[PDB]
RNA sequence: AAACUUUCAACAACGGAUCUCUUGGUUCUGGCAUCGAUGAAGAACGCAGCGAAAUGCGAUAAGUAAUGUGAAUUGCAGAAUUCCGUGAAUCAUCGAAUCUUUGAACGCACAUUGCGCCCGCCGGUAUUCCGGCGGGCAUGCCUGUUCGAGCGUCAU
RNA sequence: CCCACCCAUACCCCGCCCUCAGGGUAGAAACGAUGCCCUGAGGAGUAGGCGGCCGUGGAGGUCAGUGACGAAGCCUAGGGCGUGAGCCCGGGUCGAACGGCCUCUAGUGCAGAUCUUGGUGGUAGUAGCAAAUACUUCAAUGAGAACUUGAAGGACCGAAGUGGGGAAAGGUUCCAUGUGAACAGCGGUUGGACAUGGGUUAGUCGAUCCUAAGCCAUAGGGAAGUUCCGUUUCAAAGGGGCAC
RNA sequence: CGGGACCGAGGACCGCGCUCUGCAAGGAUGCUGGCGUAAUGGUCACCAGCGACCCGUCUUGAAACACGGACCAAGGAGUCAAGGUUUUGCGCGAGUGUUUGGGUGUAAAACCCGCACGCGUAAUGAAAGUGAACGUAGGUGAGAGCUUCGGCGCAUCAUCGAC
RNA sequence: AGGUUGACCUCGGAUCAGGUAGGAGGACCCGCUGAACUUAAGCAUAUCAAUAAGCGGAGGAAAAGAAACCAACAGGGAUUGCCCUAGUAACGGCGAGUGAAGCGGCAACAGCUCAAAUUUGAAAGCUGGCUUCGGCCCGCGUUGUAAUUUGGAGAGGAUGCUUUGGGCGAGGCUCCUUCUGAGUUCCCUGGAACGGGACGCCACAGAGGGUGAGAGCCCCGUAUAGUUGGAAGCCAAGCCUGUGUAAAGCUCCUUCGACGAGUCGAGUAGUUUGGGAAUGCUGCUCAAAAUGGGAGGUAAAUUUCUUCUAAAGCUAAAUACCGGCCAGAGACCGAUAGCGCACAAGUAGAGUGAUCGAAAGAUGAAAAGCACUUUGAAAAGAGGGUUAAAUAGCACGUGAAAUUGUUGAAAGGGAAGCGCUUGUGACCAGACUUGCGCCCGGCGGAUCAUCCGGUGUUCUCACCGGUGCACUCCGCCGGGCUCAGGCCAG
């Protein structure tokens, strides 16, 4: 509040012989009467450089570089090392990235929490859904005062197309701790990315893998970037036939004998 | 260049309403689109041009059709406004084509106009009868009336037969010109005020 | 989850209800079990307690205890039932104040208001289990 | 050597830091428009079986009626509840009421529980005396009613 | 003039730490390549500049993390690691939460400010408890009597009183009964203290009535206005009687 | 040719060599004894030899003077906003900026949309106004890199020209 | 009767009949009035600031508002607000500084009422009183109440077609109400499972809280469709009826076409503004006009042009909100923090008064808050108890430091404290305890080598099933041997 620490009448004593030139709440009869005033060192005081509502709360940031993003956190998503990586738990899933039929979640195949969880456990998402089930704890500190009182892990996220697999199973994925459901085309960094960390696990839908090109098409403004390295395998183009033809004999090993 | 000698934080404005600000426009507009249904959610607007020479290139949507634009569309002034058309009586037409292009977009949409009638079991001959009165609708005016073209088509083509001969002497001639008969236009009546005087005098 | 904008998840304001619920909120609060004999007769699981009930305690140091409810003491959100005491230094029997919550009802005690709210009770729940089957 | 002073350690003191807690603040967001002469906000004085305060209430005084719930309140005492019910409760709701002396505060005053006036009713032997009870008596202004004043303008 | 001897963080040799510099290290049997191997040189520091790390409150992710078979905190002549800020463990106490890693964030690190608040020492069982002449004996009460009571003595105020009553101010201090602690700078059975009760009776005493110095309404005039002046005014400001 | 002190860095081989079955030649091995635990080592308290002003601030050149400090716990002082500037990282690029607003939403998040607008793409002049190719976008001297080995010559600098 | 009898006008009275105003609140709003600190080296222009304080007046919003506007364009078109215009035009001692608007995009949109006219073949208008609810009266009012007209027009004509009033109403929405899924199953620890393990179930509900420790299934609630009962409004598909006495619209036109005065404007003074050459407001003086008047940001005259139409008035929305009420949240604070106040806090207490203004949360799951005995006058103490714990005893969770007492150890000839290095005493962390590899002997088993079949792979390497018949493999047990092993040393 922009007047605590000022709802007091205080003067300073002036410089003497006895006591610090701090203002000091005047009158008498009572404990507070003579007490310093006023200072940031000082109890019931104002502190030093007030907090203000005009902080800057909100950081904006550019849509190419949130689309960049958002590009290559689904990349990412689509490599099965960084899965597990991240800590999710993929070791029985049969294919990454995991793409289920449509007909198994359009209308209502899973808009009962019991029949989207028997599909979780056929398609191989239920270790990680049991891991996130299992790693429920409290909070250490004053987020349990405020709001916060348990952690757990992330699961499984289930993009869908609403359009063709309809919303329904929205309501049956929502009980089920750690998995969460997005539409193909309102996809969130937030959750593709969990802590600014890569690799998230995905269930697909086929009519969500079938919009996803689409979805990239109709963003104006913005196109699939060009990477600056054409091949990845720094191995294959070091040890390729082109370079090692044209090197310089090696000149040492990687352990050099001490001469002296 | 920094204005803070003045009790600045006193009128801070903060806009952390903006979302609930958002939420409450799309709230209000909900329930006066289910309030005039299944009239459209606004009024029909014409087509007008901006003022200064920097505007006048681009059209925009105006505040209401003229009288005259409306006497022309057989449209009453008193009937305008109770079927969504906004009437502007301020405004005047000093040109045939913007007078011509506002009839013809109130003549469009009175042709696609639904009259339903006061009474129902006493229709009129003004409004549209039942067997008629089910189609397709629109509920935005702006959208289903917008400006089409606010500008000129920046690109033409044409055959090298047809190509313009050009203002003889040049453009920026021509230009030259025209600045020099506007700042010499009194010189020269002046001068010939003069010399009809003298020739008067001394004919 | 809650989805309502009038339900609220404050801590604080939940805490602040509970220890500060007037006497006929607190009855509701003050809610017991019923036994598996009760709740296929009656189709009920739920009902608040009150003086005359026979319950059987399920929880706590005094478990497996039976007798009838001899005070329903809203105040500490506690009940006494008979012969479930302790004795104080001096001899005499003080009453075990058990929350209603650690015992099961094995015996209503039956009149006009109890058995309404019994029937509108089990009306109910037919409805919902017809509305959603 | 002890005592004394100092140091080190254990236990006990003094004191209330630390840790954990939070029916509380602080900030943001959403919704709503509702004080008063039909007497407000504020003040004072009272009211519980046993309270000083806080809370609630006004001589109908921790309250009445009405609606709803349906078996309590509790520190003690004393009573319950026909439990198959016009019905417990420091219960909720709340449309009917009560609402002391004051206060814009309104008969005149007030540092006084001071002094009046008008009209009814009742009681005491009472045409006269005494006492009690009830309803009233502020200012400015508006509309209207009624009673008036003035050679101010006229008719007769 | 001569010979030997003593020792500085100086000079020489060796080891180790850091910094800088120069090399090596992939048809990878290949590496926290931000790594590892070889070689050389250098090492003080105020104002000032730069880098890396340690610690605290909170947020996201992660460790299928720890925990009532004991979390956090605290004490510790008990240990281990780090140049260091610090980190980790053992033992005792205790009772409900907390931590490691990578990012994010800040009301984030104290010996000072005659700093703020709170608590506590030496001084120190010290200064002092010395104005108003003064106390003593027996008995009772009581656990306990210089400062309670009764009696017995001795004194003081000395009628402008240490007497008997009021005005202001206080508000129950008045009276009876009882009383642990606190207070009565010693004590206390006593008390204006504490607890429970009781007590203030008017035609004649005051107030109430009158007006004084003075203050405030009204008429009316000022003032943007809160309001100022005005108290007999430039006011239609009211009483009585008679009537066929 | 003796006598003594301190030190043993490295860790398969590679080398320089020599007195050449081997070696003192690019850094210690071999043999032996006692003990195997508080014996070595460590911490604490104390004595002993030597060493050693009380901290912070201020002042000037420096001391001295002066100021603050009885003790302990907790609190306690370069923060936030706006506007510039230089540098770093990122996206797009003669363009760039979704978030005033609209759509949408699992609802203060995320996702989507475009008109205008800001900055940049042209300057100069007080203004009216005018407005950037003689040339492979010029000549000369350097200049990394490349080269068919004759030269082509990035950035940048100096200088002479052109608009 | 005329010295009488009256009608008006103006001004009064009444505790006359009926009404209204005051004060509170004031965060936001409409006005008035109005500083100084500060920033300019100082400082009378300036800045802070047309702000704080003071005064008057409203509402849920207020205010503004349907051009005497902007413009100069191919013209826009009431008001308000956001973005931009723009730190720009412009103002400014000795310069510190100040600073709009038109256009453009968007949010939201909504238009109108009088005065100036003769109803004049009919004051057609209205307050109040009494009503039998049909009306009848006392009056107001012609010094003007109705109808008609408001500049976008209108009035009068012509002309031929169009338009209208009531009553039901299915259904829908808003607000309080009844009701909602699943374990208290077995084992261990524990005072108490809500902890761990096992077996299940519910989930459009795994938000939150309580319950003797971390509970989806013990309880309240939570999600979603609905489902009971009640009240008051609004919207509304449609359906019955009267029809033209009257009103209303469109089209055309000779003619007519009233339009706000101590006001506009000018001078002067003060104040204000970016408008110190172009601003607004107020006071004094002067004081208009009829195609007139205002404006067109440099003074004036002449001739043009373009825009509106002042001096009367009303009106929702988009906008503001440190006040009030209801509600939901947070990378906020966690009892010296956070509001002064988490507590009988604007309280106790101080001051004549205006005013000033604290400190202060936590036993335990449950009082189970210590029976009884004993010692003391008592407070209390000791036994004995409660509790899982009194190492939790209403001084109460945890219980640091300063500082104090006891016990143990030590030192001390006018300071201690600190650094380097031994020693003494006390107390400790490590390290070690044997491993590996052979040669024999004794046991206990064929997951020895090869081959066959199947399978997988890195496509030549493996696993599995049969085959070994014990000079081969794998463990164990006794010896013997070599090597490596801890500390201090020669």
Redesign the pocket.
Known sequence: ??????????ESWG????????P?????????????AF???????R???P??????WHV?????????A?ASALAASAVAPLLMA??H?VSTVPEVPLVVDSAAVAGDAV????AA?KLLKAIGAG?DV??V???K??????????????????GPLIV?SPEHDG?EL???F????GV????V??????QLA????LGRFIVWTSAAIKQLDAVYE?????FL??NIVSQAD??RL????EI??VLRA??????????? | ???????WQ?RV??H??????????????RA?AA?LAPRPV??L??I???????????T?????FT?EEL?AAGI????A?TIGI???????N??EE?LAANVQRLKDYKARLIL?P?????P???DTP?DQ?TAETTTSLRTSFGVEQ???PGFTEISKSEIPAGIEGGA?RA??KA?SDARLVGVREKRAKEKAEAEANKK | ????????????????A???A????????????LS?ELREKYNV??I?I???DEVQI??????DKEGK?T???????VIHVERVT?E????QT?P??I????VVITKL?????????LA??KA??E??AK??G
Request: glycine residues 8%.
């Open positions: 509040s922009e007047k605590a620490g000022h709802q007091t009448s205080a410089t003497g012989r006895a006591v610090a030139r701090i000091r709440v005047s009158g008498g009869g009572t404990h507070r009467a003579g007490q310093g200072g940031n060192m000082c109890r019931s005081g502190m030093f450089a907090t203000k509502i005009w902080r800057k904006k940031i550019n849509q190419g570089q949130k689309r960049f958002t991240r800590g738990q808009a009962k929490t019991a969880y270790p049991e891991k089930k299992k790693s704890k409290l909070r250490a500190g004053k987020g349990k005062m405020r709001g916060r009182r348990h952690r757990q892990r992330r869908y919303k929205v309501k049956g929502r009980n089920i701790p969460e459901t997005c539409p085309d309102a996809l969130n960094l937030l969990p802590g600014g960390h109709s963003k104006k403004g913005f970037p060009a720094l191995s070091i040890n390729s036939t090692q033809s090696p000149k040492g090993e990687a352990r050099t004998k001490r001469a002296c | 260049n920094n204005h803070f000698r003045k009790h006193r404005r903060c952390f309403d903006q979302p609930g600000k958002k939420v409450t426009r799309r709230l209000a507009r006066k309030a606004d009024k607007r014409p007008v041009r901006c003022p200064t020479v920097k505007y006048n290139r681009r925009r949507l105006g505040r209401g009288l006497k009453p002034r008193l009937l406004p906004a009437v502007d009586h301020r405004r005047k000093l040109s913007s339903f006061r009474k129902s079991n006493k009129k001959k003004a039942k009165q606010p500008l000129a920026y230009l030259r600045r | 989850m809650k989805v309502r904008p009038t339900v609220s998840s404050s801590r604080r304001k939940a805490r602040k509970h220890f500060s007037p006497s006929s909120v607190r009855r509701v609060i003050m809610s017991a079990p598996k699981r739920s608040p009150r003086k005359g399920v929880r706590g140091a005094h478990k409810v005070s329903v003491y809203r105040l500490k959100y302790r104080k230094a001096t001899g003080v075990i104040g929350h209603p919550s650690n005690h039956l009149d006009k208001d109890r058995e309404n709210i509108r009770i109910g729940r409805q919902v509305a959603k």
